[PDB]
Design a protein around this nucleic acid. Structure first.
Ligand SMILES: [Zn+2]
Ligand SMILES: [Zn+2]
Ligand SMILES: [Zn+2]
Lengths: 104, 107, 150, 25, 182, 105, 211, 256, 69, 91, 214, 91, 144
RNA sequence: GUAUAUUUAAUUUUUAUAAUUAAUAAUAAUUAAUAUAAGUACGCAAGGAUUGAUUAUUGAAAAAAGAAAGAAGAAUAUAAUUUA
């Protein structure tokens, strides 16, 4: 038991840092540091499509950075893209429908 | 227990410790063959002198009865006629330098 | 110059923290209930002919609610009707309705945000004196935690 | 020596309500 | 095959426990636990003698009614006691009973109390009186020795002051000599 | 590459044990197709630059034949013809989106 | 099983403070002041010089290197300053881009049509700074002049300060690294937006304290 | 959220390090110089075979003491890297030179004389050396006993070393109790008087004849136990004789 | 809640931090680990310094409560 | 551990490591009270060098006799006459 | 130790300096952080034959010795071998453990007075006499002035016959002046080397010399 | 540490013994407290029914005090004083 | 700070400036060990060089830094030197004026209110005792 | 129902690269809590369902082409921390 090609399916992305070329996924892998992970784009979920007008469209075929911008002219905090919340409510509590009382 | 702690009382042997029976000094520096009993007061015996001062025999129970400053075995002290021992006569079977007495003491 | 509290050092630390203006800054919150809403609920209950309406503020005291309301009703049907009326009055910000099958035929509680209304019968109200407990309980003293465990 | 043990639930509601702080202190 | 011996850093308590070699000041607990033939731990020598008997008699006279446990506690409280473990005391009481000095007596309580025989207690009373007289004489001699010691201490102070004066003058002379060279 | 691990927090009080993956120099290393069969189009993407002496002779020969800078690792992705990118293209981490769904192998 | 024994701190011993004040508001205000404060140890480098030798050999010639650089940049003697000598790691597996990476002979901007970089040409580095009063344009001009002179000296090598530096001192590299933009643009401290007036007031206060 | 594999789990001998958040338990302060845990994980020294961790600690102490006594030591198997790292730690203690460091080294080693020798010579010997003070060569000659790789662990900067200068270890001396061979160009060196006296006292024991009787008795013991190539105690000859003593005395006087 | 500091994971600001607290209400003794950077768990060390004697006695109180429980 | 001169009774404390297992029960040392090399007898245990796995340092614990000896030699009453001479914390 | 950090600035001990230890200035603004100050250690000091003999001689001179009085007497004495008050306290502790010095809370004053054990008083007297005789025999210049020696003997006899308290005080003042004058040029250096005994306990071997600063 | 804690507990017990215990108020004090409570309620409260508040306080005074002990009566008297001073705790 | 890789950067300098707030009691004369990444070896070598304070460490020069880092064996001496240089000026300003905008008047008022509130608590306890004594006296009167 | 043969599990050690087809782990997991719809459909009335979301149930996996008797670590978590 051990070394084996495992494949987590549909892990949401959480944070992109294109200055340092880092992607943060809100999960923990059972893999050692330095492993060459392969990232692919999930094509559907819950009977829907990942790319669509309701959610958005990708940089098809890939992302081509503009000409004027220069990553060497930007700090690390100016080059981070945080994802919208994955959950809908505070998971310590319950949703307002199931909650006895809510503060708002 | 083992190694009875002697912090309160150092448990040292004075150079001029006199044999309880023959009344002669004990020189602990040369050898430890002598017999010491703290009983904390202090008692000292030569290995030879440990025998009863009256019958000059060993102690069956390893216990003696001091009388007139001299150690007399329980039979002699109680008055029962001394019965000659069989296993050994002139010894005491005690252990030298408190080793047979280190079991009891102050902690 | 000792201090009556069991833990003198911690009690002195807490007193200094409270005086310097740090406990209030840390605990400050603007989500307090509204006496106007309390009065509107009082008027609704009076219109529905509820008896012995009490409004006890619990914001200062350690609790999970502010401005608890207590009322006594003549029967389970009256309790259910009053609860429905309270929920309808809260309809604007209300998120969900109460059960239509009264689980407890002698006690119904409608939570309205920070405010909570408890409608009971006279017997149960006299049995459990929540009003007396919440009126007698002392406010949240920061030094109160400077005592022995229990 | 450091924790105080008390039986508050055995007391009546009135006592446990009007003398909780006094007993705890 | 014990965890303590397996520990990378053997503790001193475990080291002492393992130190069961047949030598002076070796652990007595381990030797006693070992078979009698293997080791040489013989019977504990005790003095069931006249001086211990007199000490026990004095303690009993002080606490006329007393249990064995209470007498042992009093002995423990007393600093310069020639007894230990209370087994020496029990043996002393046994020999005293055999010699008609101290006798036991049963009571309604499950325990029994040791009293002093009437035909032998009178000797203890005079023995205690003589001991008190000797103590008073020793105290008077100690007071005389204290007076002699204070006088000798005054003389010692005088001669020590003389020695200090001469030594200080010698040191001053040495320092003055050492100043000339520099 | 799997860079490190940290903990982040949502706008709400939700804590996520995030794993940060580093994306070194990435380039489309090769294009493949099994005799033009439909659906067999594949793009091979490199992972990280590497010296000449690092790789085995056959791997070095493969990269020399490709003409792309030598890469330590090369993965493959089945795609559609419209998704092709020229060999030697530079891929930025912004190829993905903050909130999308990724398959991690 | 507690991590700390009762004697971890000496009995009846005072402990030094670890934060300004218990008040969160004043703590945040002090944090904002310090964050918006200008850097005090910041020094833009006029030019980073580099040698293929080791620090234990370049320390002896460090002063001579400084004098020769000052002569080369046509400045009054003692006008330039040298930063700490930094020896780059002897990486068995080269990794371009790391600060402690031996600088290569060339760069892509210099030889775009090359299938590899030229071998290592610097194992130790030392920054050269001018007077802080010098403008950014002046610093850039001095760095470019020094770089051009050193490049010409190397080319002709393949008397004057450049030749002396190349031959005697042994330096065989020089660069003008980009500005350290890692600094933080504190537009919000403790969740509170930094108003322009507040930022200007903090800057004025720091300037007054410095003067 | 929790990781997939929860708790401290043992992995393969050669496995990578993952930064997944788990409660880490260390037996003690592994950062201490001479108190290092032995294990097959990358953060621990290799654990050479022993009957117990206490026995492993005893073996480590013996190896370090022998290294200090004579810089060069030949050790078989996984204990070679452990010995090298322990020697580096001893050098670090010596360079630190603190009284607490000296007391720690005294606790560790078996020989206070060797503790003093290390704390006296290693500071100046490795003042100019940063990190690696011990080298570990691998010998192509494997032990016939159990066919285990042998490693020659040596200290560096022998020239800067004072008591070990000009020593060549290509081949051991004629007798183990004689001073080690000396390079021809370094024949005039003189060792510290205290170390010289200690070595002379140690060698006198073997120079005694009762040692010759013990040697013959060892021949007899091994012959009885089963070791094959043990010549009969009738044929064995003493290691030390008068003519050899005077020749070696002349050699020692010449070497100084 | 108001509590003491039983332990701190790291000595300098970092996301991989965390701090232990021993809150003690009327009749509740809860020892909790709180991580920094959480927008909802606003934890503030209200004093500029701490007392090791206070830490010791509070730790003793927690130990007694845990044993009794 | 505590070691006491055989004759003098002067006691000194020193922890014993694994390297000196066969010198715990008995020792030989230059006692200060008597200016001669004298035998020293073990009396009590202070604490092992190092520490056992996964436990605090002081888990083995000094013996009560060692604690009492240390208290007598460095306590409030003992330190009072000397603390005035020089604050034990500094010079 | 260093004057500026271990003591407030301006505090200097006129004892015996350590060999090769550099007296380096420290800025007045210097101050430790409390945790570092707690974690700070101290170099072990000599508690052996010479320091204990010196302290016993000082106590023999001034049988009633207060704390400040004892320190001042030690500083005044020209045979100083100690280095600092910490060294003095360590030597006093060693003497107490050996069973030489006894500390008593004086009834007249709260200060802790010091006395010498009567059992050890004979040993102290023997040590003092032996040291005095050794110094007298070693001093080569001493005895060159027979007239001076005779006058000093006459002074000793005069002090013995009369009340010698004033004479002793004047001699103490003269000794202090001479010690200052000596310190102006010479100084007693201490040189130490650590070693490990057979028991495994790290100790220090010390030797004291006299160096002329000039 | 245990000895110090026991000593502190003994000191606190001594201080508590020195301090007086709670006492049962007299009829005049009870009437004054009731009048103050009624007047304060009438002046302050606006949501709760004044008649119900008066009835509840009357029932408390005439029932709970009699049912409980003297110490509880004194505690309730002090609590009523606290309520009068702190605005009835919010009503 | 301690984790700085290769050269020091404005990010590290700003980190040091930010944590200056978290280190209030630090004075320009503070002992050198407070400097980030200053190991035992580094501080021992600085003491040998007679450097005892952050002010002196910052006052050092490039040649001294080089001879400390490459001949004395000190490691990260550049890091500690940069720390001292970046922190000295705020420390000097703090020494000249400890609390700027700290509202010393506000702090004095807070201390006065703390004293007044403690005295008020003691007076409340004494008043409770007096009330208990008055109740006892009233009970005595009723008995009479 | 007391390791041999068959059988099965795994391996045969960096293979730049999963999948044209062979075989092969998950064909309605129900259930429980709360809310929506809705206080609706329906019912004489009291009364009052059907019902895809959230939570609970916590895990998520791809075989076949390259050079081989030391420790896949020059082992103290850096593919050299200066090092003589
Ligand atoms: Zn005899
Ligand atoms: Zn007989
Ligand atoms: Zn002795």
């Amino acid at each position: 038991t051990g070394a084996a090609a495992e494949t987590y399916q549909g892990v949401p992305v959480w944070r992109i840092d294109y200055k340092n070329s880092l992607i943060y996924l809100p999960t923990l892998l059972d893999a050692d540091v330095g492993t060459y992970v392969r990232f692919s784009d999930t094509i559907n979920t819950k009977g829907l499509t990942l790319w669509n007008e309701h959610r958005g469209l990708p940089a098809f075929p890939t992302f081509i950075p503009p000409e004027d911008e220069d990553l060497s002219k930007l700090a690390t905090d100016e080059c981070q893209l945080k994802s919208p919340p994955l959950y809908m409510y505070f998971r310590d509590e319950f949703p307002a429908t199931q909650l006895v009382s809510q503060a708002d | 227990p083992a190694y009875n702690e002697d912090v309160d009382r150092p448990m040292v042997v004075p150079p001029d410790a006199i044999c309880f029976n023959c009344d002669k000094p004990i020189d602990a520096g040369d050898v430890n063959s002598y017999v010491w009993i703290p009983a904390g007061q202090g008692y000292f015996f030569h290995f030879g002198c440990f025998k009863c001062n009256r019958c000059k025999y060993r102690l069956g129970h390893n216990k003696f009865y001091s009388k007139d400053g001299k150690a007399w075995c329980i039979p002699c002290a109680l008055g029962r006629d001394v019965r000659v021992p069989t296993r050994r006569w002139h010894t005491s079977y005690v252990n030298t330098h408190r080793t047979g007495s280190r079991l009891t003491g102050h902690f | 110059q000792p201090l009556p509290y069991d833990d003198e050092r911690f009690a002195d630390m807490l007193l200094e923290m409270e005086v310097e203006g740090s406990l209030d800054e840390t605990w400050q919150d603007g989500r307090k209930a509204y006496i106007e809403d309390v009065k509107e609920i009082l008027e609704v209950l009076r219109s529905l002919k509820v008896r012995d309406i009490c409004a006890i503020d619990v914001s200062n005291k350690t609790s999970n609610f502010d401005y608890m309301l207590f009322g006594t009703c003549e029967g389970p049907r009256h309790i259910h009707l009053a609860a429905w009326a309270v929920q309808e009055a809260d309809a604007l910000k209300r998120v969900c309705k109460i059960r239509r099958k009264q689980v407890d035929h002698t006690w119904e509680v409608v939570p309205v945000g920070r405010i909570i209304v408890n409608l009971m019968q006279e017997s149960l109200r006299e049995e459990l004196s929540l009003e007396r407990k919440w009126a007698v309980t002392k406010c949240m003293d920061p030094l109160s935690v400077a005592n022995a465990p229990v | 020596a450091a924790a105080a043990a008390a039986a508050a639930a055995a007391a009546a509601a009135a006592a446990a309500a009007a003398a909780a702080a006094a007993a705890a202190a | 095959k014990e965890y303590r011996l397996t520990v990378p850093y053997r503790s001193e308590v475990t080291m002492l426990r393992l130190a069961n070699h047949k030598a002076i000041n070796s652990n007595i607990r381990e030797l006693f636990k070992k078979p009698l033939v293997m080791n040489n731990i013989k019977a504990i020598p005790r003095d069931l003698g006249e001086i211990p008997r007199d000490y026990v008699l004095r303690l009993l006279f002080f606490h006329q009614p007393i249990r064995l446990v209470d007498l042992w506690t009093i002995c423990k409280e007393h600093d310069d006691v020639p007894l230990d473990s209370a087994k020496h005391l029990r043996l002393v009481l046994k020999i005293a009973k055999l010699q008609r000095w101290v006798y036991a007596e049963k009571n309604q309580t499950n325990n029994l109390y040791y009293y002093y025989v009437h035909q032998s207690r009178i000797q203890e009373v005079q023995q205690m009186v003589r001991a008190s007289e000797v103590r008073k004489k020793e105290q008077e001699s100690v007071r005389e020795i204290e007076a002699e010691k204070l006088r000798m201490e005054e003389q010692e102070r005088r001669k020590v002051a003389l020695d200090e004066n001469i030594v200080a003058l010698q040191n001053a002379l040495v320092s003055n000599i050492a100043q000339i060279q520099e | 590459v799997k860079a490190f691990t940290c903990k982040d927090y949502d706008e709400l009080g939700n804590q996520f044990d995030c794993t940060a993956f580093w994306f070194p120099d990435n380039q489309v290393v090769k294009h493949s197709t099994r005799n033009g069969e439909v659906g067999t189009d594949k793009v091979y993407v490199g992972a990280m630059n590497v010296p000449v002496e690092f790789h085995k002779p056959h791997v070095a020969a493969f990269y020399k034949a490709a003409g792309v800078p030598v890469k330590h690792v090369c993965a493959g992705f089945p795609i559609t013809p419209d998704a092709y990118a020229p060999v030697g293209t530079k891929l930025d981490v912004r190829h993905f989106k903050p909130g999308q769904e990724v398959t991690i192998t | 099983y507690w991590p700390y024994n009762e004697d971890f701190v000496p009995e009846g011993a005072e402990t030094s403070r670890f934060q300004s004040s218990g008040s969160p508001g004043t703590r945040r205000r002090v944090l904002q002041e310090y964050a918006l404060s200008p850097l005090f140890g910041a020094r833009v480098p006029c030019c980073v010089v580099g040698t293929l030798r080791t620090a234990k050999e370049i320390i002896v010639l460090k002063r001579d290197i400084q004098s020769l650089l000052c002569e080369l940049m046509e400045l009054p003697q003692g006008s330039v300053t040298l930063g700490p000598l930094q020896q780059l790691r002897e990486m068995m597996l080269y990794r371009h881009g790391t600060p402690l990476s031996p600088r290569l002979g060339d760069e892509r901007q210099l030889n775009m049509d090359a299938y590899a970089r030229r071998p290592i040409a610097a194992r130790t580095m030392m920054d050269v700074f001018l007077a802080e009063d010098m403008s950014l344009d002046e610093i850039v001009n001095f760095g470019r002049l020094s770089l051009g002179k050193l490049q010409i000296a190397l080319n002709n090598l393949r008397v004057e300060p450049a030749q002396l530096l190349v031959d005697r001192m042994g330096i065989s590299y020089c660069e003008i690294p980009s500005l350290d933009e890692s600094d933080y643009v504190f537009a919000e401290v403790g969740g509170v937006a930094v108003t322009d007036e507040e930022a200007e007031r903090v800057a004025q206060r720091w300037a007054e304290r410095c003067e | 959220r929790a990781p997939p594999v929860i708790g401290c789990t043992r992995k393969a001998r050669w496995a990578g390090i993952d930064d997944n958040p788990t409660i880490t338990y260390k037996p003690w302060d592994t950062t201490e110089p001479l108190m290092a845990d032995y294990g097959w994980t990358r953060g621990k020294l290799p654990k050479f075979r022993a009957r117990s961790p206490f026995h492993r600690q005893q073996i480590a102490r013996r190896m370090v003491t022998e290294m200090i006594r004579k810089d060069y030591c030949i050790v078989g198997g996984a204990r070679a890297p452990a010995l090298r790292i322990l020697a580096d730690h001893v050098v670090e203690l010596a360079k630190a030179g603190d009284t607490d460091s000296r007391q720690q080294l005294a606790y560790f080693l078996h020989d206070p004389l060797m503790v003093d020798k290390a704390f006296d010579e290693y500071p100046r010997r490795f003042k100019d050396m940063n990190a690696k003070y011990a080298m570990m060569t691998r010998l192509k000659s494997r032990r016939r006993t159990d066919a285990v790789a042998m490693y020659f662990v040596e200290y560096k900067n022998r020239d800067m070393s004072d008591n070990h200068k000009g020593e060549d270890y290509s081949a051991g001396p004629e007798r183990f109790f004689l001073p080690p061979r000396i390079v021809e160009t370094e024949k005039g060196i003189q060792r510290p008087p205290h170390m010289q006296m200690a070595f002379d006292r140690w060698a006198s024991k073997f120079k005694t004849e009762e040692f010759h009787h013990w040697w013959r008795l060892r021949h007899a013991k091994l012959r009885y136990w089963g070791v094959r190539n043990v010549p009969h105690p009738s044929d064995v000859d003493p290691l030390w004789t008068e003519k050899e003593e005077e020749e070696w005395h002349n050699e020692m006087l010449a070497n100084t | 809640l108001i509590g003491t500091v039983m332990d701190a994971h790291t000595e300098e600001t970092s996301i991989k931090g965390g701090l232990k607290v021993y809150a003690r209400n009327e009749e509740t003794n809860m020892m909790l680990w709180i991580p920094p950077g959480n927008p909802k768990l606003r934890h503030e060390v209200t004093s500029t310094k701490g007392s090791f004697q206070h830490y010791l006695d509070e730790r003793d109180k927690w130990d007694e409560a845990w044993i009794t429980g | 551990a505590l070691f006491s001169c055989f004759r003098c009774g002067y006691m000194y404390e020193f922890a014993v490591s694994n390297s000196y297992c066969r010198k715990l029960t008995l020792r030989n040392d230059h006692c200060p009270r008597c200016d001669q090399l004298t035998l020293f007898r073990f009396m009590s245990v202070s604490g092992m060098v190092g520490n056992m796995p996964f436990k605090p340092i002081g888990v083995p614990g000094p013996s009560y006799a060692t604690l009492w000896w240390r208290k007598t030699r460095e306590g409030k009453e003992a330190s009072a006459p000397l603390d005035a001479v020089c604050k034990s914390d500094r010079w | 130790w260093q004057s500026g950090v271990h003591t407030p600035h301006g505090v200097v001990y006129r004892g015996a300096k350590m060999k090769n230890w550099p007296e380096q200035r420290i800025p007045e603004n210097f101050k430790f952080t409390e945790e570092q100050r707690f974690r700070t250690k101290a170099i072990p000091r000599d508690v052996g034959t010479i320091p204990r003999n010196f302290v016993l001689g000082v106590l023999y001179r001034h049988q009633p010795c207060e704390v400040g009085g004892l320190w001042e007497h030690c500083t005044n004495d020209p045979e100083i071998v100690l280095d600092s008050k910490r060294h003095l306290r360590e030597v006093l502790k060693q003497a107490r453990e050996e069973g030489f010095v006894t500390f008593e809370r004086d009834a007249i004053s709260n200060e802790w007075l010091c006395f010498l054990t009567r059992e050890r008083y004979e040993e102290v007297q023997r040590i003092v006499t032996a040291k005095s005789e050794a110094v007298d025999t070693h001093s080569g210049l001493r005895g060159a002035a027979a007239t001076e020696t005779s006058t000093y003997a006459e002074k000793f006899r005069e002090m013995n016959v009369e009340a010698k308290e004033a004479h002793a005080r004047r001699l103490e003042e003269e000794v202090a002046n001479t010690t200052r004058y000596l310190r102006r040029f010479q100084q007693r250096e201490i040189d130490y080397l650590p070693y490990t005994d057979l028991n495994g306990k790290v100790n220090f071997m010390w030797w004291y010399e006299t160096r002329d600063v000039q | 540490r245990a000895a110090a804690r026991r000593m502190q507990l003994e000191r606190r017990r001594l201080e508590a013994s020195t301090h007086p215990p709670p006492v049962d108020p007299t009829a005049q004090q009870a009437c004054v407290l009731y009048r103050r409570l009624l007047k304060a309620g009438h002046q302050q409260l606006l949501v709760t029914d004044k008649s119900y508040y008066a009835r509840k306080v009357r029932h408390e005074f005439e029932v709970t005090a009699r049912q409980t002990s003297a110490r509880v009566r004194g505690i309730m008297y002090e609590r009523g004083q606290w309520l009068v001073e702190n605005k009835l705790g919010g009503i | 700070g301690i984790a700085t890789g290769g050269r020091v950067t404005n990010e590290d300098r700003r980190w040091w400036l930010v944590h200056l707030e978290c280190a209030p009691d630090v004075t320009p004369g503070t002992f050198i060990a407070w400097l980030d990444c200053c190991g035992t070896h580094t501080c021992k070598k600085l003491i040998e060089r007679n450097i005892w304070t952050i002010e002196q460490v910052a006052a050092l020069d490039s040649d001294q830094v080089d001879e400390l880092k490459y001949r004395e064996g000190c490691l990260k001496m550049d890091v500690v030197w940069e720390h001292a240089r970046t922190i000295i000026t705020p420390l000097r300003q703090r020494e000249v004026t400890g609390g700027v905008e700290s509202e010393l008047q506000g702090r004095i008022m807070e201390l006065r209110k703390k004293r007044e509130l403690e005295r008020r608590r003691e007076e409340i306890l004494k008043e409770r005792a007096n009330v208990s004594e008055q109740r006892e006296e009233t009970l005595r009167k009723l008995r009479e």
